[PDB]
């Protein structure tokens, strides 16, 4: 069954910028998120289809996510993955996608158009607990590589 939800986030960086900037999420988030220890390239050469590995602490304890390349259409501005396995991925669910678009902004920012689709297993439905979660991921994400261009104004 899938179940969508849709947020929205605002930004003072153009979409060209944040968007360059997303696509090196890998590189970027085990610098800036301490419980991010590595990002890695298990299958696939990085574009939509490849499968990824991260090491991650929640609560002080060691655990692994499983990602999945799922789209990249540039001239729309767009990166989508989704969550395959590990801790992250409930046991009622089958894969939960995160998708991120930018389009403009007033006084030259952004909007940063998020979704969460939520794929489950039989007719079990996401939990509260579950959704908020995936909320939080998602609008954390973009804060994060948001705060980093705004640190980093020189290579974006
Ligand atoms: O604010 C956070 C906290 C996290 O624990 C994570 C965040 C953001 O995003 C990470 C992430 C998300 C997408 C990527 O392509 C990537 O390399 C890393 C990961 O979900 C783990
Ligand atoms: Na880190």
Request: glycine share 42%.
């Given at each position: 069954g899938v179940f969508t939800f849709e947020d929205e986030i605002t930004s003072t960086v153009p979409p060209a910028k944040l968007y360059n900037a997303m696509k090196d999420a890998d590189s970027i988030t085990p610098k800036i998120i301490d419980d991010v220890k590595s990002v890695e390239i298990?299958?696939?050469?990085?574009?939509?289809g490849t499968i990824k590995k991260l090491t991650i602490v929640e609560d002080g304890e060691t655990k692994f996510i499983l990602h999945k390349v799922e789209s990249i259409d540039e001239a729309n501005y767009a990166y989508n993955y989704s969550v395959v396995g590990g801790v992250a991925l409930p046991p009622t669910a089958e894969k939960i996608t995160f998708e991120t678009k930018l389009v403009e902004g007033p006084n030259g920012g952004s909007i940063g158009k998020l979704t969460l689709k939520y794929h489950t297993k039989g007719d079990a439905k996401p939990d509260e607990e579950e959704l908020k979660k995936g909320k939080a991921k998602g609008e954390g994400l973009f804060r994060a590589i948001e705060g980093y261009v705004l640190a980093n104004p020189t290579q974006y």
């Open positions: 298990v299958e696939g050469n990085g574009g939509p």
